[PDB]
Amino acid sequence: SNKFKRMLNRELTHLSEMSRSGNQVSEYISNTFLDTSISRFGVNTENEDHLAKELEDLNKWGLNIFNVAGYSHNRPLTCIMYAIFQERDLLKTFRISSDTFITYMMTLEDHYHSDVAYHNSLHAADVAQSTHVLLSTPALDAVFTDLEILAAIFAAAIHDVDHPGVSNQFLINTNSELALMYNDESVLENHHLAVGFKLLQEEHCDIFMNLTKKQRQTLRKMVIDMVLATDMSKHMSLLADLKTMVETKKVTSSGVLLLDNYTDRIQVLRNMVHCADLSNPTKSLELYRQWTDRIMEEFFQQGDKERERGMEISPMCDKHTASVEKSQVGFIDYIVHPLWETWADLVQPDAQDILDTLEDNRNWYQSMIPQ
Amino acid sequence: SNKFKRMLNRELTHLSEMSRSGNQVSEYISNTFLDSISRFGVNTENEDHLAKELEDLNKWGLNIFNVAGYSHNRPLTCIMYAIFQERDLLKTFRISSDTFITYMMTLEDHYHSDVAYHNSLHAADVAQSTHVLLSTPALDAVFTDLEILAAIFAAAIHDVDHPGVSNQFLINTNSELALMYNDESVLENHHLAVGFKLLQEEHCDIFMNLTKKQRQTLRKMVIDMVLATDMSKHMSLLADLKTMVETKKVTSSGVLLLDNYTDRIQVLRNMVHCADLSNPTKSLELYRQWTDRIMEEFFQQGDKERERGMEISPMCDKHTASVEKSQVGFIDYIVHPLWETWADLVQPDAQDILDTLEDNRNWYQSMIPQ
Ligand SMILES: O=[N+]([O-])c1cccc(-c2cc(Cc3ccncc3)cc3cccnc23)c1
Ligand SMILES: O=[N+]([O-])c1cccc(-c2cc(Cc3ccncc3)cc3cccnc23)c1
Ligand SMILES: [Mg+2]
Ligand SMILES: [Mg+2]
Ligand SMILES: [Zn+2]
Ligand SMILES: [Zn+2]
């Protein structure tokens, strides 16, 4: 659609001229978004009661994933994934032993880096838990098969495995081996998928051993589609497709969405995990503020690596010139809010408290803008 | 004193036999503690917000995180220029704003931003706390300006170029730095070298206008103070501070009597040491943030150790921490004893500092699980 494209670049030109704040946010958007305990929980802990209290939020959008990390000896991913699989009865359905499951989930957690401020197992655990809540949205809850539920949640788990804490564009600009291996197109996301699936081959880790061949093939395609869709530069095209889907949606009976073909189904799932990935500003302000401070830490360190190298500092990576408050407002106004508004429309009446929390958070960061 | 060494050994033995948790805290202790531009010095357009945070310059409660926030992440440059304006040190030592900001920016730039705790934020915190501690009524008339300058500069540079790993990791991994300094005070020697080496940069010689004798005395005092921040020297500094307390003299205006260089430097080095260990004495919002940072830095070191197939040093294993219990041990066995001794030396001064420590301690105990 040339109209949407013409409209997009208009919206960003105007922002780019509002102020130097808007220029830095507008440069960022274009370069980013455009093309008993070990079996009770998955984990050893002598805090079984504090952990059991936190995990009562398993199905709530307000689950505090930071506290889970605290009471799980810093295994928020293994712990949450075990909880989701118990909750949805996925181990039994797919004949996965708890043993194989925990060994895989520990190996996966281990390949997330804890020295990366944001793209580490905590973020993986949050995105997986948020996907778990989203899959229970009433308009979809009856729609997806368990194979699709498994694919989505696994997708979420692995979606950033082995992330180094720098962007696809830095990896291309520094001529990384990874950029070289994947020919500059979706560098990290291809890698996340490779690692996640490669790890099944490790000893006692094939959590899909007991699926049929046709099941494995369907899972793998679904998962590849979802993770490649977390590539941020695909954001505008994903939102375009979601909007056209809203305007031509079919409700069946009792509020449920009609998704006949594979295309319709994967489009929704991949927007779902994409939404999970951008759910930080829709969570409670305590949660959201921690996430912001982490991503900025990570952007700033990329900025220093650029500076060490004599490269030009990327937008939002200069610690000496960021405006974190104005940037958050822009990010909500121009990316998070449009995406979540469209999602709310697809799945109405759901997502509305999510949308209201999003405005509170946005208004809090506005209230904190000096001058 | 052999009876101090025996007593010290006794309490740590009792501690490690208490439980798994006390074992690990006791292993830790033994391995660690025994042997716009015109106005603020930074360019910001948050001149109002920054000015308000900086009204706490002379208070224990200053929030250095917010200062970082309003100073475009130049907390050290900003705080140091505030302290130096406050005490009129730039005029007194004829240091120009150009020379001073250029040095301070260069110094701040050599603290690593990718290190969770030992960055310019911690340096700025320790600098501001030294500044507050130097105004303790019992000492406040005692020290000359050269001594004040040394102590504050010492604090500024005390961890510059810290790589986020411990003296023992550097020895165990055969670091070039451990090779250079022969396994003794590796980082602290390095911090001093860098801090002084940086005066030689273009427009950075902030001590250019001091006399030779002044430069010589300042350098001796600074070296003394920074080597003193070596954690492995903790117990012998405390032992000295305790025998200082028991043999203390006071003029009458409530002011301590410090004639010789030895008693003077002994206070100055316990002061910066106490500033370095002040996190748990601060308000709870601040201390929580510091704990989380130092724990991140230990955990990363632990992963580097695991990446190398070494055994994971105490407190560096992310899968076997008990942060809450560890903070309570830290306070009972290291922070509280030190500050209690400090409070005695300078009484009635450090008494709320000390009550805050109790509050913080008890909050961390109230969060211990089960
Ligand atoms: O101006 N902004 O739009 C702007 C400014 C500062 C931060 C962000 C931002 C991007 C992303 C998604 C993401 C993650 C990793 N790489 C790229 C994008 C996630 C975020 C989560 C919390 C806070 N900020 C975020 C956006
Ligand atoms: O139980 N503990 O003793 C224990 C457990 C966990 C953390 C600490 C700890 C040590 C040091 C001083 C330090 C800084 C850098 N390297 C070595 C020591 C400073 C701290 C500041 C805030 C919180 N914990 C700290 C102590
Ligand atoms: Mg990603
Ligand atoms: Mg140090
Ligand atoms: Zn992600
Ligand atoms: Zn220090």
Side-chain angles (χ1 to χ4, degrees), chain B residues 118 122 158-159 162 188 191 229 276:
Chain B
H118 295 98
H122 162 70
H158 91 277
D159 287 311
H162 198 307
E188 296 79 20
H191 302 323
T229 67
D276 211 15

CSV table of all heavy atoms in Angstrom, one decimal, chain B residues 118 122 158-159 162 188 191 229 276, ligand 4:
chain,number,residue,atom,x,y,z
B,118,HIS,N,31.4,-0.7,40.0
B,118,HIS,CA,32.6,0.1,40.0
B,118,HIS,C,32.8,1.0,38.8
B,118,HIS,O,33.7,0.9,38.0
B,118,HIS,CB,33.9,-0.8,40.2
B,118,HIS,CG,33.9,-1.6,41.5
B,118,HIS,ND1,33.5,-2.9,41.6
B,118,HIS,CD2,34.3,-1.2,42.7
B,118,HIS,CE1,33.6,-3.3,42.8
B,118,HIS,NE2,34.1,-2.3,43.5
B,122,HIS,N,29.6,5.1,41.4
B,122,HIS,CA,30.2,4.7,42.7
B,122,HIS,C,31.3,5.7,43.2
B,122,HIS,O,31.3,6.1,44.3
B,122,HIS,CB,30.7,3.3,42.7
B,122,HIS,CG,31.7,3.0,43.8
B,122,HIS,ND1,31.2,2.8,45.1
B,122,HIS,CD2,33.0,2.7,43.8
B,122,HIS,CE1,32.3,2.5,45.8
B,122,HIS,NE2,33.3,2.4,45.1
B,158,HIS,N,39.5,6.7,43.2
B,158,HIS,CA,39.8,5.5,44.0
B,158,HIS,C,39.5,4.2,43.2
B,158,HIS,O,40.2,3.2,43.5
B,158,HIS,CB,39.1,5.6,45.4
B,158,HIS,CG,37.8,5.0,45.4
B,158,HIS,ND1,36.6,5.7,45.1
B,158,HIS,CD2,37.3,3.7,45.9
B,158,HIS,CE1,35.6,4.9,45.3
B,158,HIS,NE2,36.0,3.7,45.7
B,159,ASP,N,38.6,4.1,42.3
B,159,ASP,CA,38.4,2.9,41.5
B,159,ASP,C,38.5,3.1,39.9
B,159,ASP,O,37.9,2.3,39.1
B,159,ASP,CB,37.0,2.3,41.7
B,159,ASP,CG,36.9,1.6,43.1
B,159,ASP,OD1,37.8,0.8,43.4
B,159,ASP,OD2,35.9,1.9,43.8
B,162,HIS,N,38.5,0.3,36.8
B,162,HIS,CA,38.1,-1.0,37.4
B,162,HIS,C,37.5,-1.8,36.3
B,162,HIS,O,36.6,-1.4,35.6
B,162,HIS,CB,37.1,-0.8,38.6
B,162,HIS,CG,37.1,-1.9,39.5
B,162,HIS,ND1,36.8,-3.2,39.0
B,162,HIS,CD2,37.2,-2.0,40.8
B,162,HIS,CE1,36.8,-4.0,40.0
B,162,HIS,NE2,37.0,-3.3,41.1
B,188,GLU,N,44.3,-1.3,43.2
B,188,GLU,CA,44.5,-0.1,43.9
B,188,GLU,C,45.7,0.7,43.4
B,188,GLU,O,45.7,1.9,43.2
B,188,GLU,CB,44.5,-0.3,45.4
B,188,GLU,CG,43.1,-0.9,46.0
B,188,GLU,CD,42.9,-2.4,45.7
B,188,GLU,OE1,44.0,-3.1,45.5
B,188,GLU,OE2,41.8,-2.9,45.8
B,191,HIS,N,44.5,1.9,39.9
B,191,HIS,CA,43.7,3.1,40.1
B,191,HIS,C,44.6,4.3,40.3
B,191,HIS,O,44.4,5.4,39.7
B,191,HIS,CB,42.8,2.9,41.2
B,191,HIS,CG,41.9,1.7,41.1
B,191,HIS,ND1,41.3,1.3,39.9
B,191,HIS,CD2,41.4,0.8,42.0
B,191,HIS,CE1,40.6,0.3,40.1
B,191,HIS,NE2,40.6,0.0,41.4
B,229,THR,N,42.0,1.6,50.4
B,229,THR,CA,40.7,1.1,50.0
B,229,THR,C,40.7,-0.4,49.6
B,229,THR,O,39.7,-0.9,49.2
B,229,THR,CB,40.1,1.9,48.8
B,229,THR,OG1,40.8,1.7,47.6
B,229,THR,CG2,40.0,3.4,49.1
B,276,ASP,N,33.6,4.4,51.2
B,276,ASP,CA,33.6,3.2,50.3
B,276,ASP,C,32.6,2.1,50.8
B,276,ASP,O,32.0,1.4,50.0
B,276,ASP,CB,35.0,2.6,50.2
B,276,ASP,CG,35.2,2.0,48.8
B,276,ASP,OD1,34.5,2.2,47.9
B,276,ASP,OD2,36.3,1.3,48.7
C,4,MG,MG,38.1,-0.5,45.2
